[PDB]
Every structure is written in C-alpha cells, then in structure tokens.
Amino acid sequence: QVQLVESGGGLVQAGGSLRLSCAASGFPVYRDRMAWYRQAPGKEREWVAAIYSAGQQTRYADSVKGRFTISRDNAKNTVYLQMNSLKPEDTAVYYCNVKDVGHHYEYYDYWGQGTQVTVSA
Amino acid sequence: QVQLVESGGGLVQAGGSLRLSCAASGFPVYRDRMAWYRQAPGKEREWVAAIYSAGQQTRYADSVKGRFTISRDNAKNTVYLQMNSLKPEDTAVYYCNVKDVGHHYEYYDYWGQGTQVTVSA
Amino acid sequence: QCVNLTTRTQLPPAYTNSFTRGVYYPDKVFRSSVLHSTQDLFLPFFSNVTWFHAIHVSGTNGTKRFDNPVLPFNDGVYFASTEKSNIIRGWIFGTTLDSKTQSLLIVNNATNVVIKVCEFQFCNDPFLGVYYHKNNKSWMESEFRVYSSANNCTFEYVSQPFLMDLEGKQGNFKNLREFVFKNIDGYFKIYSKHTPINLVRDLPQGFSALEPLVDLPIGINITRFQTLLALHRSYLTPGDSSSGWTAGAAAYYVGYLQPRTFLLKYNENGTITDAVDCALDPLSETKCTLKSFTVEKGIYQTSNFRVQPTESIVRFPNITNLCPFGEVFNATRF
Amino acid sequence: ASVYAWNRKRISNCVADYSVLYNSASFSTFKCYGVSPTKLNDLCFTNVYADSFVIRGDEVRQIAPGQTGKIADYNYKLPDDFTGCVIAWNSNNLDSKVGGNYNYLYRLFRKSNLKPFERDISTEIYQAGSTPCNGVEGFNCYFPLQSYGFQPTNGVGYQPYRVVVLSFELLHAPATVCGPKKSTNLVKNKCVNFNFNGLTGTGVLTESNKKFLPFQQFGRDIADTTDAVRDPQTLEILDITPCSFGGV
Ligand SMILES: *[C@@H]1O[C@H](CO)[C@@H](O[C@@H]2O[C@H](CO)[C@@H](O)[C@H](O)[C@H]2NC(C)=O)[C@H](O)[C@H]1NC(C)=O
Ligand SMILES: *[C@@H]1O[C@H](CO)[C@@H](O[C@@H]2O[C@H](CO)[C@@H](O)[C@H](O)[C@H]2NC(C)=O)[C@H](O)[C@H]1NC(C)=O
Ligand SMILES: *[C@@H]1O[C@H](CO)[C@@H](O[C@@H]2O[C@H](CO)[C@@H](O)[C@H](O)[C@H]2NC(C)=O)[C@H](O)[C@H]1NC(C)=O
Ligand SMILES: *[C@@H]1O[C@H](CO)[C@@H](O)[C@H](O)[C@H]1NC(C)=O
Ligand SMILES: *[C@@H]1O[C@H](CO)[C@@H](O)[C@H](O)[C@H]1NC(C)=O
Ligand SMILES: *[C@@H]1O[C@H](CO)[C@@H](O)[C@H](O)[C@H]1NC(C)=O
Ligand SMILES: *[C@@H]1O[C@H](CO)[C@@H](O)[C@H](O)[C@H]1NC(C)=O
C-alpha cells in the first residue's frame, strides 16, 4: 500500500530555518510530481509548490520565489522541504500531495496529515 | 465547553414518584441518540432507556415498560425522566450518556456523573 | 371511495359508417398545391365504427344508455363525440389499470385540461359526478371516483385556463369533437378538431383535416383505455348515488387505426382538402399509382396478385436405419 | 432532509442550464463522471434524479465510483459505472448555529452493502454480536444513526457541505431534459449556413408571401426539398433559396 507521514513544523520565530519531511512507504518518491500545499482557514484551495522528475524540475508560485526550497531522496524515499526567511503570514497547515490513477479512470489526490506552522514576529 | 448535569434522586419511600432532569449545555439534546443507564453495586452495565430524533421515538428496557416515561424540551434544553410505582430494583445510579463521532472515524462517549436513587420499603 | 354504478342495461353494440373522416396531418411539414402519398396509421375510408350513447329514456323501467366500457387501445383510436353539454371529460390509458403499472389520465375540470402520468389506483367504475344545486345555481365538483390516490407521479401537464358549461342543454347536436390517439416510438400523440355542425342525426359528409394537438415523450406501454363522463344528480331522480343520477343526451363513435397508405391533397393554403385511401378499391389503387386525383381513360397496371401458401407439409421416407443403441442401452452387464 | 433520507427529485421535459452552475465557482466540488462536463449543455437526457443531502467535508470524496466508506457503502451506493455529476458546496456560513447544528444524521453501520439507488425504510438495530438486539440496545448493540458535530469553530474537513447528485438516466424512452440552445441574430439576402430546429443547410433567406398554419414550422416543395421555414422568436415565414451557382 501507500503510506505518507509528515514530520516537522511547530511555532518558530521569523528568520529561522525549518525542516519538513514527507516520508512515503510503498513507492519511491521518483514519480511525476510531488506537491506541497499551504492551507489557512477562510480561503479556497491553492497550489504552493511542486517538484517534478520530468520536464521542469521545480515549480513555485511567483510570490514564493527564493523563499521555499524542496528536494527528494530516493535512498530513503523521502521529500524534504526547507523554509528560510519566514514571514508571519505563513502560519497555516502544510500538506504533501501526490496523484494516483485508478483502474476505472478515477484519479486520487493522496494527501497526508499535514503540519501546522506558526511564525511569531 | 460541553457540560451535562443530572438533577434529582436521593432517598425515597416505596411506591412514590420520581422526576430526574438531564441538562446538557454546549450542544442541543436533539441529536442522534440520548442514553440512560442504571448501575447497581456489583452488577454489570446494561442499557436502560434511549431517545432518538428519527425512527422510533423512544426505547425502554423490558423491565420498566408501562410505568416509565421520558420527554425532552429543546427550548429550555432539558430532558425530563418521570417514573411511578417505585420498585426495590430501582435503587441504583442513573447515568446520562451521549455519543459523538470524530473527524478520523473515532467515536467518543460522554458519560454523565449520574445520580443515586435509594428506595426504602 | 370507488362506487360501482348499477342499473346498467345490456344492449348489443351498434355500428355506423365512418365515411371519409379521420384524416390528420401526418407531420409538421407545410405543403402547398401538391399530392403527397404517405404510409401511416389511419382509419380506413367507409369503415364501420362502433357507436355509444348517453341518454335517459323516460318511462317505467326505461332504458338508460350510459356506456362506459373498457376498450383496448390497439395501436391508435379515433374518438368522435357529438355533444351539446360537454359530457366527455377525459380519458384514461394503461395496461393493468392499477398502481402496479404507470397510467395516463387526461381530465377537464372545467378550468384546465390536466394530464397526469401516475400509477393511479383505478376504480372498477371510475367516473365523475357533479350535484346540481338548484337552490342558488352554484357549480362545484362533488364526486370524482376515478382514482383513490396518486402515488409516484412522473409527469404533469396543465392546459390553458377556461370555463366550460356543464348544465344539460336541449336541441339537436351542435358540437363535433374528433380526436386521434396514437402511440409510436414512445410518443403519445393526440390530434384534435372541433367543428360546429348544422344537422339533426348522423355525422357530416364534409372533409376536415385534424390538426396536431400535443405529443407526450413518456415511452410507456398502453394497451387499453376507457372514456369518462360527468353525470348529474338532482331531486328529479330520487335515490342513492348508484341510482339517483341522470346523463345528458350525447353520442360518440370509436374506431381503430392500422397501417394504410393515403394520398393527401394540399391546396395553396396548406389545408388538406381531400384524401384517398389507397387500399379501399381498385380505382383508389389507380389514383395512388398515378399520384393524381383524376384518372385518364385507359388501362393502368396497379399491383400484383399472388396466391399465398395455405399450409406447410413435411414428407419423409420410411425409417429404415438406426444407430446400434441396443448394444449400449439394452445391455445386461457393464 | 437527512443524508440517509436524501431528497430525490425527478426532472424531465425542461431546459437545464449548467453554464451558470459551472461558472458560478461557488461550489467546492463539481465532478461529472460518465459524461463530458462541457457537453451537458449540448446533450439531452431522458430523466434526471436529483439526490440532495448534507454531509461533512471529508466524506465528499467518497461520492465517486469505486470508493469505500460509510456514506458510499451504508448510506448512498453509487455504481462503478455511474453516469452523472456531483456538486458539493460548503454551507458553513449558512448552517452555523449556536451550540452546533445536529439536525442532520447519517447512517453509521448496516447489515449489508446498499444496492444502487436503494431507499431504506427499515431502521433495524445493527447486530454486532450473536444475541440479536431486536430493538433493545446494550452490549454488542450500537445504534446505526450518528449525529454531525457541525461546530462553528471546527475545521474545514468537518464543516458541513451540501451535496446534490444529478444522475442522468436514459431508457427506451425519448430524451426529455435538454441543455440550453444558443440563438444567433439572423441575416438575410446572404448565402449563409442555417440551422433551424436541427435542420442544417446553406442558402439565402428572404421574406415569403406564403401563409403558414399557426402550428406549422417549415414547408418543403416537391422532391422533398425545404423551401420555407418559420423563424421562431419572430414567427416569421421565410422562403429559402439555394445559393447562386452555375457553370463556367
Ligand atoms: C371491483 O368491481 C366489483 C364489482 O362487483 C366491486 O368489488 C367486488 O365486490 C365483490 C362483491 O362484494 C367481491 O367479490 C369483491 O369485493 C370485488 N370483486 C373482486 C373480483 O375483487 C367493486 O365495484 C370494485 N372494487 C373496488 C375495490 O372498487
Ligand atoms: C441562490 O440563488 C442566487 C441567485 O442568483 C445564486 O447566486 C449567488 O447568490 C449568493 C447568495 O446566495 C451570492 O452571494 C452570489 O454572489 C450569487 N452569485 C454567484 C455567482 O454565486 C446562488 O448561486 C444560489 N445558490 C446559493 C447556494 O446561494
Ligand atoms: C422570446 O423571449 C424574448 C424575451 O426577451 C421576447 O422576444 C421578443 O418578442 C417580441 C414579440 O413577442 C418582439 O416584439 C421583440 O422584439 C422580442 N425581443 C425583445 C423584446 O427583446 C419574447 O418574450 C419571446 N419571443 C416570442 C416570439 O415569443
Ligand atoms: C356497418 O355495420 C352494418 C351492420 O352491422 C354492415 O351491414 C356494414 O357493412 C358495416 N360497415 C361496413 C363498412 O362494412
Ligand atoms: C349555494 O348554497 C350552498 C348550500 O350547500 C352553499 O354551500 C354555497 O356556498 C352557495 N353558493 C354561494 C355562491 O353562496
Ligand atoms: C413509484 O413509487 C412507488 C412507491 O410509491 C413504487 O411503485 C415504485 O417505487 C415506483 N414505480 C416505478 C418506478 O415504476
Ligand atoms: C388562402 O390564401 C389566399 C391568399 O393567401 C386567401 O385569399 C384565401 O382566402 C386563403 N384560403 C382560406 C383562408 O381558406
């Protein structure tokens, strides 16, 4: 089967370095696309970051360039997300997302539990 | 928060009448299921009474049919439990109980403190 | 709720000539000054249709003609009512005539023509009865004994509002309403025509095409039907509801359609002024072959005559050879 | 009504506008399976079953073919080959009341998986153990109906969502519900492509001195060639002529 677990997050002072680890078991991370989504109450669903093994390697939003970094490790089958130079508006829940295809043409957007990140200024 | 209180009970003579009141604040009593249990000293737990907002209006134990009634009031948010023709088997602790479902398919039962009823012949 | 009316008399059915009535527009298409030949369901020309009456003959033990029998739908019905007081008030269509199967119900409540598609619980004597309140001359619905309840409605239609008179009138017939009901490709099609007439008896010899009225895309199965009449109860007929009632003088004719080929003439206005039934007689065969209403003097080959086979006979020689089944079946030891 | 008593409506013989629903963007989920979402406006359906109910947020994804869960298995079963669409929208700002909204209830357990489009009229108590409950609760006896904790301060995953499932069924019956039709301003005295009531062609449209009957739509001359047609929205009878052509 497919198991996804998130580690990291919490409450931090602005300007520090934070680590988020999305570990996947049952399948290597090396696939089409691993996405990272940031959700706060009061707004619709919006895509934040993505990493691809084909075509363009990484894609980020225009207002997040130079701020959020992503990487992957096939040796231990994990995705790393590094947060640097945080702003207080980043307090929200983070999810690592993958897409899978079913036998009857269905498509599943597998998410994880998510991690709560709070920035204090 | 959510808090429930049971009022009534005590020491009473045989053949009298009793009227217990279950008052719950933080959530309406008009819900899936409202439960009432009896606990005897050194005896096992057993279902006694239940009221539902769908299907059957009320459900009672087989040993208390015909001499025992229960009603609810959503305006003042209180459940009245009226009983007549007291029997020695009624000397026990009454519990008012609710059940709720979580976000992760987890079910939590809020149990009441209960009230002691003693019958003297 | 359903009440079985009694005191009905048994009379053998009556038959009358349909002449050249029963021509409706076969499509939406406008045609001008042409002769169009089309094959479709029709009433044959000069065919005998069945007759039903609505009358109360006076006298002791007098005959009271009040005919509401159940008749099969077949594959299309022509209903021609000659009326003076609007006795027919709708139709019912179905197969089992119960809540087990869906049914069609058209009723005129003197305000609108309402069509309902429901599993109605049809009575064994469905009808309508309106009590005549002579004290203040008030008209109001009193009894509908057509369905006990409406369950799982599927289609509802309402016509334009109107006001139809219900009190019985005297004099000769003046209203002639012709209707054609067809069930093709899941469509229930109703064509209608209203005509004032100046006659005392029988049906007029004039030719009048029937304009389309409504089409219903329901895709249900219909096998039988029954007409519906509105009766009146008054002090002049003492008794209970089963006997204390009267019916105004009216009549109607029922015929059945079938696949026939017709040649229709469209004038410049697009009105079908004349029609010819191809299979009626050899002269009509000639007219259809020539695609013309006027035939010139001479000889014309119309069709081909061939005697159909009567029976099938299979003849085979005597049975001489069989597989050696006695070795296998009728054996002593295995 | 309750989700286990989802309100079912039969829809036939009308114009169903899905452009406004698609472009409203007020629905969190709009997922049509078995049909092309852009083609609902261009296709007709025999009957529509509208199943309206209220669930919580995380149960929305269970309304899909091949899904497993409480709602899909015990409340509302969808076939693996389901042909229809699901529209789910949040109603937190509309279904928020002091103390929480517990009016809606959902079936928690059932003896067996529900058949597709099956309505339950029996409220039998789930039998967990060997001793049947028989309408009496106790040990190995849990009520199959459970409340919703629609608290105002709860997360979006637990927030109430109103879900309407429109199932498009076609049988050996004519199509009744139809999508909206686009009407374009007519042009005269020009060799143009025309499409009247699905009858397509090319020609030149001009005024006609002919007189249609009130119910007639279009007329064809001999040899089965349409020579006139009544433009709707003006009810104007127009003659039609083939575009001018010849040899060189
Ligand atoms: C069906 O028609 C019959 C007319 O005789 C009525 O009900 C019948 O009544 C007889 C005699 O009482 C009994 O055999 C049954 O009650 C009915 N017959 C059958 C075969 O069931 C009545 O007019 C109609 N029934 C209803 C329910 O309206
Ligand atoms: C209810 O009807 C309205 C009328 O058009 C629909 O339109 C929206 O209504 C809400 C208020 O209910 C407004 O806030 C929106 O601005 C309206 N427009 C859009 C595009 O959403 C509405 O969609 C219908 N349904 C609901 C659930 O309100
Ligand atoms: C079609 O709907 C529109 C509603 O805007 C109407 O069209 C008008 O029809 C009248 C004749 O009934 C014309 O005089 C107008 O020029 C049309 N356009 C307008 C008013 O903008 C009308 O309700 C419908 N058309 C028909 C023929 O019934
Ligand atoms: C109509 O009925 C009469 C008597 O039953 C019969 O003689 C006549 O031929 C019938 N009509 C036709 C067209 O046969
Ligand atoms: C006529 O009399 C009847 C008596 O039953 C009454 O019900 C009805 O309302 C009266 N009509 C009018 C218009 O008053
Ligand atoms: C209509 O509903 C009734 C129950 O009221 C039942 O016959 C069945 O569910 C439906 N009939 C059909 C779909 O033919
Ligand atoms: C047919 O049309 C012509 C001209 O349009 C008209 O003179 C004639 O009266 C019409 N015939 C009718 C209305 O029966």
Report the nearest atom of ligand 6 relative to the CA of C151: 5
Question: What's the CATH architecture for C14-301?
Answer: Sandwich (2.60)
Distance from first CA to last CA of chain B, Å, rounded?
42
In angstroms, the CA C31 to CA D224 distance is: 10
Closest residue in D to B103 (Cα–Cα): D158
Q: Which positions ≥6 away from C270 have C-beta within 8 Å?
A: C30, C31, C32, D211, D212, D213, D216, D219
Question: How many residues in chain D?
Answer: 248
Q: Which positions ≥6 away from D43 have C-beta within 8 Å?
A: D35, D36, D179
Report the nearest atom of ligand 1 relative to the CA of C4: 23
- Secondary structure in 3-state letters for B40-104: CCCCCCEEEEEEECCCCCEEECCCCCCCEEEEEECCCCEEEEEEECCCHHHCEEEEEEEEEECCC
Extract the tokens encoding D82: 């389901």
- Measured between alpha carbons, how far is residue B113 from residues B3, B22, C320 in Å? 11, 11, 100
- Secondary structure in 3-state letters for D72-101: HHHHCCCCCCCCEEEEEEECCCCCCCCCCE
Q: How was this entry determined? A: cryo-EM
CA atoms within 13 A on the CB side of B9: 19
Residues in chain C with CB shorter than 8 Å from the CB of D12 are: 154-155
Nearest CA to A20 among A63, A99, A12, B103? Answer: A12
Task: Point out the residue among A39, A41, A104 whose CB comes nearest to the CB of D80.
Answer: A104
Strands B115-120 and B10-13: parallel
- Going along chain C, which residue ranges are E strands? 14-17, 34-42, 48-56, 64-66, 71-72, 77-83, 88-94, 103-108, 113-118, 128-131, 143-144, 155-158, 175-184, 187-196, 211-217, 224-233, 250-256, 258-266, 272-277
**Residue B17, Cβ neighbours under 10 Å: how many?**
10
Q: Taking CB atoms and an 8 Å limit, are D66 and A41 in contact across chains?
A: no
In angstroms, the CA B86 to CA B69 distance is: 13
Q: Taking CB atoms and an 8 Å limit, are D136 and B100 in contact across chains?
A: no
Nearest CA to C212 among C187, C240, C175? Answer: C187
- Measured between alpha carbons, how far is residue D81 from residues A42, C277, D64, D116, D199 in Å? 36, 51, 10, 11, 34
Question: How many residues in chain C?
Answer: 334
Q: Which positions ≥6 away from C290 have C-beta within 8 Å?
A: C300
Alpha carbon dihedral C108, C112, C117, C121, in 10-degree steps, equals: -40
Nearest CA to C252 among C25, C16, C75? Answer: C16
Distance C256 CA to ligand 4 centre (A): 15
Strands C34-42 and C258-266: antiparallel
Strands C14-17 and C211-217: unpaired
Report the nearest atom of ligand 2 relative to the CA of D91: 27
Q: Which of residues 1-30 of B touch D (CB under 8 A)?
A: 26-28, 30
Classify domain B3-119 at the CATH superfamily level. Answer: Immunoglobulins (2.60.40.10)
Q: Which positions ≥6 away from C182 have C-beta within 8 Å?
A: C41, C75, C76, C188, C189, C190, C191, C257
The domain ranges of chain B are: 3-119
In angstroms, the CA C109 to CA C89 distance is: 8
B95 min Cα distance to partner chain D (Å): 14
Angle at D230 between CA D227 and CA D231, to 5 degrees: 120
CB B112 within 8 A of CB B96: yes
In angstroms, the CA D164 to CA D147 distance is: 20
- Measured between alpha carbons, how far is residue C134 from residues B81, C55, C138 in Å? 61, 21, 7
Nearest CA to D199 among D234, D230, D236? Answer: D230
D135 min Cα distance to partner chain A (Å): 39
Alpha carbon dihedral A25, A30, A32, A33, in 10-degree steps, equals: 70
Residues in chain D with CB shorter than 8 Å from the CB of A103 are: 66
Could you say which ligand is closest to the alpha carbon of residue C135? 5
Write b or e for each residue in D21-50: b if 16 or more Cβ atoms lie within 10 A of its Cβ, otherwise e: bbeeeebbebebbeeeeeebbeeebbbbeb
CA atoms D232, D233, D235, D237: torsion sign: negative
Task: Point out the residue among A39, A44, A102 whose CB comes nearest to the CB of D66.
Answer: A102
Q: Is C38 in the pocket of ligand 4 (CB under 6 A)?
A: no
Distance A104 CA to ligand 6 centre (A): 32
DSSP 8-class letter at C134: T
Angle at C313 between CA C308 and CA C316, to 5 degrees: 150
- Rg (Cα) of chain B, in Å, rounded? 15
- Report resolution (Å) to 1 decimal: 3.3
Q: Which residues make beta-bridge pairs with D11?
A: D48
Q: Whose CA is nearest to atom 21 of ligand 1?
A: C124
Distance from first CA to last CA of chain D, Å, rounded?
74
Distance from first CA to last CA of chain A, Å, rounded?
42
Q: Taking CB atoms and an 8 Å limit, are C30 and D10 in contact across chains?
A: no
- Measured between alpha carbons, how far is residue C173 from residues C63, C82, C169, C194, C202 in Å? 21, 6, 10, 13, 10
Using left for φ > 0, alpha for ψ between -120 and 50, and beta otherwise, residue C270 falls in left
B33 touches chain D (CB under 8 A): yes
Residues in chain A with CB shorter than 8 Å from the CB of D28 are: 44
